[PDB]
DNA sequence: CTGGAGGAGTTTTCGCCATGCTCAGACTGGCGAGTTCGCG
């Protein structure tokens, strides 16, 4: 999963040895793992031309599992196995918010080629304070369209989510560290699964 | 974290003021197709000095309808506006990105309070 | 290819009006900035591209001035030309394991292509021709003050595909900088020129390209951009006589008397140059 | 080659601006950092390479001033030369019996390789020639304040190798450090010098190399780097008169009282030097 | 003065392979109710 292209030829020997050693002995993982996965996450851009009509995900099951394991072992943090609505960590909260924004957009404009995930995933995780205002501003246009629908479809529900999540934040940070970006990714992954999971 | 009535950060106060104005308009003309949030949200956050002098006119125009009915819900808004503006000194001509983020945060904090019991 | 015999430093100034000097592919398309202070940034590769374009336009494929054509080219097909010209047969991933012919291909490349002779390149691909370092180098350009981008909304009369809106049909966006002034540094090394053969006439052509860079670069999003100043420091021997950072300090820029808040023209700033150490010659009429 | 007769220690400062001082082979090419605190790092191995390059450039292969670790050389061949010069046969992974002492070849190498004479080397390979420890040592450099690297994305309008899937574009990314300040420590010992003949002229050349190191190292990735300060402590006898850690404490770096926010130039810091004990003299003008 | 040898130090002979793919979606969700001061 960490190869440049998903092919065994590009696997770094250092990781090959270190992962096996740590697995057998229970020692700390190699320190280069987290940046290695983050690079692959931030570089990939799948497109609809792939055979599967729905576009490919980049935050896959395996990568999330790896990040969780790394954070638990080396950094001594705590991470739930599924969404926890009482976390209150700024990276986690931002990761949660991104998912609802994308969900609203993709409902407002079906079949778009370029979603916010295709244009803002990297910078938003790196420098939250520089991009988030634009995303919030566009969310207004996206939501208002649903409101005027005869059925009103969603509109109230998404705004309720946005209000409740935001209530625990005070300011947008200017910069974040690597582990903070890992928390951001985990938060995004959990929230995404929370949707699509009433029926 | 929740609405802090003592923060006194100018973008925060502006964000609160915008939410209260939107609430007043919604009360005045139910079911409007277009709302100030759609018309002005982009402009106000970037250049406050250009639009607020206009929003405040419609504010009074709306409150006039309510105060002219037996609907007494209608000096509450005027009291809130007096409280909020009491800390401002001047309107910025332009604002930075992080300041706009703080503006949005203040807006959302304010909005939630209005819908509590 | 007689090389130059001195060390050089130089400074360049330019500004923009109502345009986007360089967009950021990873954040919508905003101009590049420093996230911590709001100063603008421009990558050197942009300036290198502009210089290459100007040289190609002015020389038009003359002998020994091929630009290593980059637009839609395939590089290995160019390396194989060097291999065949020297009558060698390329190996799967290695230079010929015979020293004389190994450098002959590299010398051939260096002779024919101007941009290789000036900036260098990497050619260790499946067909191998070696590496080059390049006498000329440049650093990132940085603005003198924070900039405040503006975002403007646009509309359109038509749609591209089968959208069932049915009149007004679409909306767009732009980002522009009302005004800004930038500064750039650079260096030239004599020992490397002695290896690639970078010569004086090339230096003259380089000065000309720097002066006339933007004249041919008009575009819908660029706006108006132009150059304003150019200062050159020439050392008196093959190795410098002073540290560069001391030299760069002799140039100072600040607001004129009528600051009047926002700057909107080159007249709002003042530029001055100090006195150089005895071992260095300073010429600024360029 | 008369050896020095005192113990020395020194400190060095240098800057970086919009560049990558030392890339990490593993984490893509991110600059090295301490994961726990975010401070920057630079391996000592990096500097010795620069010193070697400067010596090679300035002396140009003068006799008794060759360098042992040369570009893409084969070491075992160099070892065999010593046996040829001293005129005795080598053995697989063994040294000659003391009838023709191995000291002959050891001296023959120490006498005419500067880098071996200064830093030492490991030479017990298939053709064995012994070991050396080197009278000059230096430790890792660290930045005074945490740094915040940032990443840049770029594009190229050409393709290399038959990307038939497209004739089309390609993209890459690069990393930089906005600004940073670093410190380094080093030592010199007399007893080890006496075993190799490290003399005074070598020491003067070493000081010069330290002072002028970076001026010849420009590249597309390093940006602008320069040296700022150099303080030398000299002991009055063959063995020191105070612990090292006490001396290094005499130099303190702190932010200028007026500066606020992130640092962006050397003017944001202040440097001060204390008073040394009786047995040591502090010389600084370097 | 020469021997025999016990111990310290160096040289020779030993025997001589292998580990193996994979593979896909979900959903559709309506917040609440409020009152301003007052002479010379």
From TrEMBL, chain A:
Superkingdom field: Bacteria
Protein name in UniProt: CRISPR-associated protein, CT1133 family
Residues of the full protein shown: 409 to 608 of 612
From TrEMBL, chains C, D:
Record keywords, A-Z: Plasmid
Signal peptide: none
Keyword rRNA-binding attributed: no
GO biological process: maintenance of CRISPR repeat elements
Keyword Iron found: no
Top-level taxon: Bacteria
Pfam family, one: Cas_Cas7
Protein's recorded name: CRISPR-associated protein, TM1801 family
């Amino acid at each position: 999963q960490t190869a440049v292209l998903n092919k065994t030829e590009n696997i770094s020997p250092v990781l090959a040895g270190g992962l096996f050693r740590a697995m057998l002995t229970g020692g700390p993982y190699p320190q280069s793992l987290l940046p290695a996965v983050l690079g692959r996450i931030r570089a990939e851009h799948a497109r609809p031309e792939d055979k599967s009509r729905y576009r490919l995900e980049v935050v896959t099951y395996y990568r999330a599992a790896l990040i969780k394991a790394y954070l638990i072992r080396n950094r001594k943090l705590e991470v739930p196995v599924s969404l926890d609505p009482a976390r209150t960590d700024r990276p986690y909260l931002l990761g949660r918010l991104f998912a609802v924004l994308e969900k609203a957009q993709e409902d407002a404009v079906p079949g778009a080629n370029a979603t916010i995930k295709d244009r803002y995933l990297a910078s938003a995780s790196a420098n939250p304070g520089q991009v988030f205002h634009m995303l919030l501003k566009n969310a207004s246009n996206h939501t208002a369209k649903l409101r005027k629908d005869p059925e009103r479809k969603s509109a109230i529900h998404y705004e309720i989510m946005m209000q409740e999540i935001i209530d625990n934040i005070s300011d947008f940070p200017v910069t974040m560290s690597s582990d903070e970006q890992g928390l951001f990714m985990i938060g995004y992954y959990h929230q995404r699964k929370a949707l699509f999971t009433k029926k | 974290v929740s609405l802090d009535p003592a923060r006194t950060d100018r973008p925060y106060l502006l964000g609160r003021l915008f939410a209260v104005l939107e609430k007043a308009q919604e009360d005045a003309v139910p079911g409007a197709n277009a709302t100030i949030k759609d018309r002005y949200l982009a402009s106000a956050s970037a250049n406050p000095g250009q639009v607020f002098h206009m929003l405040l006119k419609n504010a009074s125009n709306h409150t006039a309808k309510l105060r002219k009915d037996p609907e007494r819900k209608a000096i509450h808004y005027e009291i809130m506006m007096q409280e909020i503006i009491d800390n401002i000194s001047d309107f910025p001509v332009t604002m930075s990105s992080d300041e706009q983020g703080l503006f949005m945060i203040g807006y959302y904090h304010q909005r939630k309070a209005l819908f509590t019991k | 290819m007689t090389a130059i015999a001195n060390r050089y430093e130089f400074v360049l100034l330019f500004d923009v009006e109502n345009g986007n000097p360089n967009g950021d592919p990873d954040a919508g398309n905003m101009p590049r900035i420093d996230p911590e202070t709001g100063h603008g940034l421009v990558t050197d590769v942009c300036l290198k591209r502009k210089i290459r374009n100007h040289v190609a336009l002015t020389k038009e494929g003359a002998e020994r001035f091929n630009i290593y054509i980059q637009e839609k080219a395939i590089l290995n097909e160019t390396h194989e030309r060097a291999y065949t010209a020297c009558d060698l047969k390329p190996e799967p991933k290695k230079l010929p394991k015979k020293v004389e012919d190994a450098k002959r291909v590299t010398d051939w490349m260096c002779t024919n292509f101007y941009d290789i002779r000036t900036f260098g390149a990497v050619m260790t691909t499946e067909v191998n021709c070696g590496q080059v370092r390049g006498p000329v180098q440049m650093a990132f350009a940085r603005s003198v003050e924070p900039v405040v981008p503006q975002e403007v909304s646009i509309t359109r009369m038509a749609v591209t595909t089968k959208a069932e809106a049915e009149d007004n049909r679409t909306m767009g966006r732009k980002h522009i900088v009302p005004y800004g002034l930038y500064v750039a540094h650079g260096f030239i090394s004599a020992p490397l020129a002695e290896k690639t053969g970078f010569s004086d006439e090339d230096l003259t052509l380089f000065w000309d390209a720097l002066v006339n860079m933007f004249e041919h670069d008009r575009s819908a999003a660029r706006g108006l951009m132009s150059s304003r100043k150019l200062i050159v420091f020439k050392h008196q021997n093959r190795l410098g006589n002073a540290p560069a950072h001391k030299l760069f300090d002799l140039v100072k820029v600040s607001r004129a008397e009528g600051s009047s808040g926002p700057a909107r023209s080159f007249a709002d700033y003042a530029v001055t140059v100090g006195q150089a150490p005895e071992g260095v010659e300073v010429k600024e009429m360029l």
